[PDB]
Amino acid sequence: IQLQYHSLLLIWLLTFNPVFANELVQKYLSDFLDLLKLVKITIKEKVSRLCISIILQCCSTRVKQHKKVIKQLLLLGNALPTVQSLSERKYSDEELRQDISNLKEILENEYQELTSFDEYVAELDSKLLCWSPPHVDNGFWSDNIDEFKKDNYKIFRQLIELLQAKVRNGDVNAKQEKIIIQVALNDITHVVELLPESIDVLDKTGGKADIMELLNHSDSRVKYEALKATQAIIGY
Amino acid sequence: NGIATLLQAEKEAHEIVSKARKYRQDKLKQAKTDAAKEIDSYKIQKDKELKEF
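Structure tokens for the assembled complex are given below, as produced in the milestone run.
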């Protein structure tokens, strides 16, 4: 605990300089998420305050690309939900509570400009999908069908590439990998049902072959998702 | 699936039949040319009557 507190203090001191904070922001994209997880797990007021200060320094306006860094942190590490949970929780330290409130306000301001489309784009870029609310939201798919097919179906091509990578990674058949594969299959089925023009692009890019390969997967959920995608493709 | 692929082939055959429907319309377009020729033939008969007068 003492070593972790000293490391957090050193990180905050380094991040006090905007140039060093900006350099360390790109050094580890998951550093903010790890710091937030450590702050949530740790009950020490000093450690939580140091973690909050370190997180705020990375997203501070002094550091370069402060808005971009804050948006990326909120999209990847779920900074807004963690900050909202911390605000609801009661902290004995007044300085730690003030830092948590400031971080929550910054996260809310960053998320106000952002939308579900930005979160979906970040998830696609990170190649991580765990059945997000947008995947199960019919309205989101209906209002984002044109965006998916935009730029010569760039989003559809990215989804097809992610599905192909998951099929290549399907040998491991990990739980997270299986969930990602199922989410990708659901997204492909939605993009085939709506905007049918994307079906030809998916077939050209080997999406049908990937679905057929996933139909023989050992996992029951993956097989069911592949069967549903095949039914949406040419089936009833 | 294999059954779905066979169904797609039936749909493709229907799509070919849908293309053949245009060919059937194209086949019926030959009668349209004859019908258009018949329209001109009626005018030719009327013109011949006018020419005779």
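Chain B touches chain A at residues 1, 4-5, 7-8, 11 (CB under 8 Å). DSSP finds one helix and no strands in chain B. Further analysis is deferred to the final report.
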